[PDB]
């Protein structure tokens with residue numbers, strides 16, 4: 001259920017993104033981009049288990 | 050006046066917004082007389098002059114045309130930074146070496 005929780009967390013992070021045309025990006029998209037390593041680490045740890 | 054038109058040519062203004070911004074800057078320049086001094090700056094994570102002018106120049110027909118051409122030749126790209134742009138604006142309005 002913790003793996004489930006991180007899956008819904010990642011889905012909400014993905015749904016929270018916004019896209020601007022020519023390389024512009026929102027002030028909150030940086031935070032969403034920094035939150036990725038936690039998700040990839042949890043997925044790798046689960047795969048290792 | 051002593052204008053300084055900060056145009057926000059960042060990524061998020063591509064398409065219709067940039068068209069309206071360049072038309073609006075042209076129509077804003079068309080309300081400046083020969084007693085008025087104006088420059089046009091543009092910022093996207095870095096603020097720069099849009100034209101060959103480095104300071105506030107008189108708003109006569111020739112200078113207004115140069116600024117209009119520079120604004121018409123402008124493109125949108127990059128992340129916004131409202132601090133490096135207003136710093137440029139407030140610095141160019143603190144120049145007293147030039148005629149004003």
Ligand SMILES: *[C@@H]1O[C@H](CO)[C@@H](O)[C@H](O)[C@H]1NC(C)=O
Pocket residue numbers: 122123124
């Ligand atoms: C001005 O126009 C010329 C010709 O279209 C272009 O090569 C140049 O990059 C333009 N200036 C700027 C600052 O983009």
Ligand SMILES: *[C@@H]1O[C@H](CO)[C@@H](O)[C@H](O)[C@H]1NC(C)=O
Pocket residue numbers: 143144145146
């Ligand atoms: C104006 O002139 C002074 C001395 O000539 C110089 O130090 C300064 O950098 C010039 N420019 C501005 C914007 O003050």
Ligand SMILES: [Ca+2]
Pocket residue numbers: 024059060061062128129
């Ligand atoms: Ca922007």
